[PDB]
Nucleic acid binder design. Structure first.
Length: 702
DNA sequence: GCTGAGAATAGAAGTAGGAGTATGCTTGCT
């Protein structure tokens, strides 16, 4: 219908995007922050947008994220106790007299409003089933853990419960349903989390494996809500996703029968599990790559799945009780009109003979996974559709279709190698250096002057990339100590090669103290590096490894890699920072579009630069600029973050595009000025040197 | 001793101590 004017819809320190024909809008803020008071707004019929109530507010703002307080913790205590916790605030758990603790007892408020680790439970064994525990932010009603007992979970006001709200102690000793959690509106899952939590609970760990039965089979049904952003560009993103899913599931030595359904308003059936080619993975793939478009009705799609399931006669077919069914539904709307689709799930469970016994519940033979995309997804319907299994997650909510692509990219990249550059698998028990294995700390003990602390990047097995200003010719090799993988041991250096065009002595008699042009250095290690879960390389620009990371054809030029990694935009980069012996990922933006000159202009607030006539004499084409308060409140770099890699996170891989070189003001361990920018060396501009010096490291430079 | 109308993060109308994708009701007159 009619549209609204955007007069004043902007948000303090954030951006917005118009969904659904401009009739709705979502607010997006920076990492750690959430848009306040509401994330979304629609266009009214009165011309204006939705009001922002919390008490009308005129404009919106981005405000820091808090992690919830444990409503209660049975049979033990936790501390520090507080009503809310800021980001990166740790809490520890202990239990009472004679109880045993399970789960992570040193949790930490992550940047996403969730606590690190898993739910702490203090149990003894005084019940048939185990103590189901209280996930942080919930409230459990019930404390008797005998057979056939129930426990109910409640979420605070304004929060949506994902998981089971009622778990019964089943025959066994395992609980029913899945552990619940409370979800805010802005809360999204990261493609790493989705990939890991889907792979696990699709498979079992012996590498993983898919557990079918003797003379058993698997039917996989892919349902796609192609009435919105999912079915755009002829299902291109969803096509990539499902191709990689089919490949990854085929890599497990199983040949499942596939069914493929799209639905905008009516269900369109492309592949049916009855076709003899329904198990031919590449026939299914070729049929998928040719789906096309063309009110959202989901019940019809689930009924098409049910018709696939149902049999041609009263007498059963052979092997009905040995087939395992998987229903992967991808949607971005799901306001369940046209009917209530839960009844279809109940009819399905009736047909599979699930939940009709006590010794044969058969819950292993039906898995339902739901991938919601965008803010307009109904967190309640998707959770009602999906399944609930102990220690398993089946509901996911991601931000764009791009993140949904990155999910399956990450899934495909899982079991390739340890030499795969820029690969990090977010695990369940991951430490700091598990998540930044390329990181390398350089320490230089300078006489009479501050101990220089720099960072680095492991670009190959013998080399480490850093910034040249960390070193000097006075510094002997017995004062430079490099450490990778977070280990005490310092490494043995062969030679530190500086760029041939580097000189910090300027431009000295011209009135400029520091000249950081071509501020890159390569440390050649004497020994070799042993790649592992803690040491791994990072991708470099204009190498075939980065082309394979960007999912591009081998006939791609270095310029194409440039315009894919560094376009004329506000590219979202990141780096890693030392914070009390901890490695934190700080997320910044590279002003390379229309704000580039505004970034470079703020270099006159820098020491010794306040009287330079031409600012292009100190900020050369070899520099990328981050920082500032536009379009977002970028975090700044530390004195010790110097030399570290400036990373771009694309297609679930990490590509280094810059080396942290200098900053306008040094205020890091922190009101902060808006001219506080940081400048990094563009690795695309020092490429001949890198190619010449790393020609024998098997990087396959373009 | 009532409220047959409108409000309300959208917003029809019916009349409901209603409902509602983060929440979730009052007018005025005696």
């Amino acid at each position: 219908q009619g549209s609204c004017s955007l007069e004043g819809v902007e948000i303090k320190g954030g951006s917005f995007r118009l969904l659904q024909e401009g009739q709705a809008l979502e607010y997006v803020c920076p990492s750690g922050f959430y848009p306040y008071p509401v994330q979304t707004r629609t266009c009214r019929s009165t011309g204006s947008w939705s009001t922002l109530k919390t008490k009308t507010v005129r404009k919106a703002e981005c405000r820091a994220i808090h992690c919830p307080r444990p409503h209660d913790f049975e049979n033990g205590e936790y501390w520090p106790r507080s009503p809310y916790y800021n980001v990166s605030d740790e809490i520890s758990f202990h239990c009472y007299d004679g109880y045993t603790l399970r789960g992570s007892a040193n949790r930490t408020c992550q940047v996403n409003g969730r606590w690190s680790g898993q739910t702490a439970i203090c149990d003894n064994g005084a019940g048939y089933c185990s103590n189901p525990g209280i996930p942080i932010g919930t409230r459990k009603v019930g404390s008797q853990y005998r057979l056939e007992d129930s426990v109910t979970y409640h979420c605070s006001r304004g929060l949506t419960l994902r998981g089971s709200q009622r778990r019964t102690c089943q025959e066994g000793g395992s609980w029913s349903g899945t552990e619940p959690s409370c979800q805010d509106s802005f809360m999204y899952d990261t493609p790493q989390e989705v990939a890991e939590a889907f792979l696990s609970s699709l498979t079992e760990t012996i590498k993983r494996k898919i557990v079918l039965d003797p003379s058993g089979s698997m039917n996989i049904y892919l349902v796609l809500d192609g009435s919105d952003s999912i079915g755009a560009s002829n299902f291109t993103g969803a096509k990539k996703c499902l191709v990689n899913l089919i490949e990854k599931v085929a890599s497990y030595g199983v040949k499942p029968r596939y069914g493929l359904v799209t639905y905008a308003t009516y269900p369109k059936i492309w592949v049916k599990v009855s076709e003899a080619d329904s198990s031919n993975a590449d026939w299914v793939t070729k049929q998928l790559n040719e789906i096309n478009y063309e009110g959202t009705n989901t019940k019809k799609a689930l009924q098409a799945v049910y018709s696939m399931m149902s049999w041609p006669d009263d007498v059963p077919p052979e092997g009905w009780n040995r087939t395992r069914h998987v229903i992967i539904l991808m949607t971005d709307g799901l306001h369940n009109m046209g009917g209530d689709p839960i009844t279809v799930i109940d009819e399905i469970r009736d047909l599979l003979y699930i939940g009709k016994d006590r010794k044969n519940p058969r819950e292993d033979y039906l898995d339902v996974y739901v991938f919601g995309v965008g803010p307009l997804v109904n967190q309640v319907n998707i959770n009602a559709l999906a399944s609930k299994k102990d220690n398993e997650q089946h509901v996911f909510k991601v931000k764009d279709m791009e993140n949904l692509e990155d999910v399956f990219y990450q899934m495909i990249d899982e079991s390739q190698s340890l030499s795969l550059c820029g690969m990090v698998w977010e695990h369940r028990k991951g430490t700091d250096y598990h998540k930044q294995p390329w990181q390398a700390k350089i320490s230089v003990i300078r006489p009479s002057k501050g101990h220089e602390s720099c960072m680095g990047a492991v670009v190959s097995e013998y080399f480490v990339l850093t910034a040249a200003h960390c070193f000097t010719v006075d510094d002997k090799e017995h004062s430079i100590k490099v450490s990778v993988g977070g280990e005490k041991r310092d490494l043995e250096i062969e030679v530190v090669l500086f760029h041939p065009n580097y000189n910090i002595n300027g431009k000295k008699e011209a009135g400029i103290p520091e000249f950081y042009d071509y501020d890159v250095a390569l440390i050649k290690l004497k020994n070799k590096l042993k790649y592992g879960q803690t040491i791994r390389p990072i991708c470099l620009p204009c190498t075939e490894g980065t082309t394979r990371a960007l999912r591009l054809p081998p006939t791609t030029t270095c310029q194409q890699q440039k315009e894919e990694l560094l376009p004329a935009q506000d590219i979202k980069a990141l780096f890693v920072s030392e914070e009390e012996k901890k490695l934190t990922r700080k997320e910044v933006y590279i002003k390379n579009g229309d704000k580039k000159g505004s970034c470079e202009r703020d270099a006159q607030y820098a020491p010794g630069y306040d009287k330079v006539k031409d600012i292009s004499e100190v900020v050369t084409p070899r520099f990328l600029c981050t920082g500032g308060v536009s379009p977002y409140a970028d975090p700044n770099t530390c004195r010790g973050d110097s030399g570290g890699p400036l990373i771009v996170h694309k297609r679930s891989r990490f590509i280094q595009v810059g080396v942290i070189s200098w900053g306008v003001v040094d205020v890091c361990k922190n009101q902060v000025p808006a001219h506080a920018r940081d400048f990094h060396i563009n690795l695309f501009q020092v490429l001949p040197w890198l190619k010449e010096k790393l020609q024998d490291e098997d990087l396959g430079f373009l």
